[PDB]
Amino acid sequence: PGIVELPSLEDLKVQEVKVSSSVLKAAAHHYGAQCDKPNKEFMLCRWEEKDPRRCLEEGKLVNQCALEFFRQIKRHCAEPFTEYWTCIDYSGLQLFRRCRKEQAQFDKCVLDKLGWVRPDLGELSKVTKVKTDRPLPENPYHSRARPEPNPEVEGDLKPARHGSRLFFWTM
């Protein structure tokens, strides 16, 4: 067949969000609140193109907007966030429910210094709409032309010409 095209290693260099999973899980509700638009443009491009090579730049925007999400935490509320993700980080299942007062301190300092409202129960699971400028893929599966169907039956049904025509049976 053909050669599969791959992007170069410079096309894959972006500054990584090099924080732990409890750090990501601690700020995840405010992350889904504040980093909505580039994340949803990326996941729309990712379910529509069905190809990650066509989804690099939007992904870079994700990694552009996540870092600016954490810098904006690090400039303002580094200590209550640190006290919060440490308590998230203790738990083996990483329970939100074991960590409600540290969550309250982090949410208080974030609403005071950044004005961010934490999403409620049922908001980040909504199907939202995304206004992009990229065109709709007319053939995301790269499917070739389908075979033409067999001709259907038409014409009025006539009797059998002289019956069964089986050796001597005249009907």
Binding site: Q15, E16, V17, K18, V19, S20, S21, S22, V23, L24, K25, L67, F70, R71, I73, K74, A78, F81, T82, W85, T86, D89, Y90, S91, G92, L93
Partner: protein
């Protein structure tokens, strides 16, 4: 009298207390002073292997926070 059965019950209770306290102290020792990560589900395993990558020292439990980003 009836308190003569209590030394054997206390010895058997220490023998039942040893495995739980043992596995609690060992899980705190081997995991950076914290609980062992429970990975029943593949998302938990993905986050745990991503922690092992982002720690830089090949350990999932070495946590990196805001100080790791600029």
């Amino acid at each position: 009298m009836w308190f003569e059965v209590l030394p054997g019950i206390a010895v058997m209770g220490v023998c039942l207390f040893i495995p739980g306290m043992a596995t609690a102290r060992i899980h705190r020792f081997s995991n950076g002073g914290r609980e062992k990560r429970v990975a029943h589900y593949s998302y938990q395993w993905y986050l745990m292997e991503r922690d092992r990558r982002v720690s830089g020292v090949n350990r999932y439990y070495v946590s990196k926070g805001l100080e790791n980003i600029d």
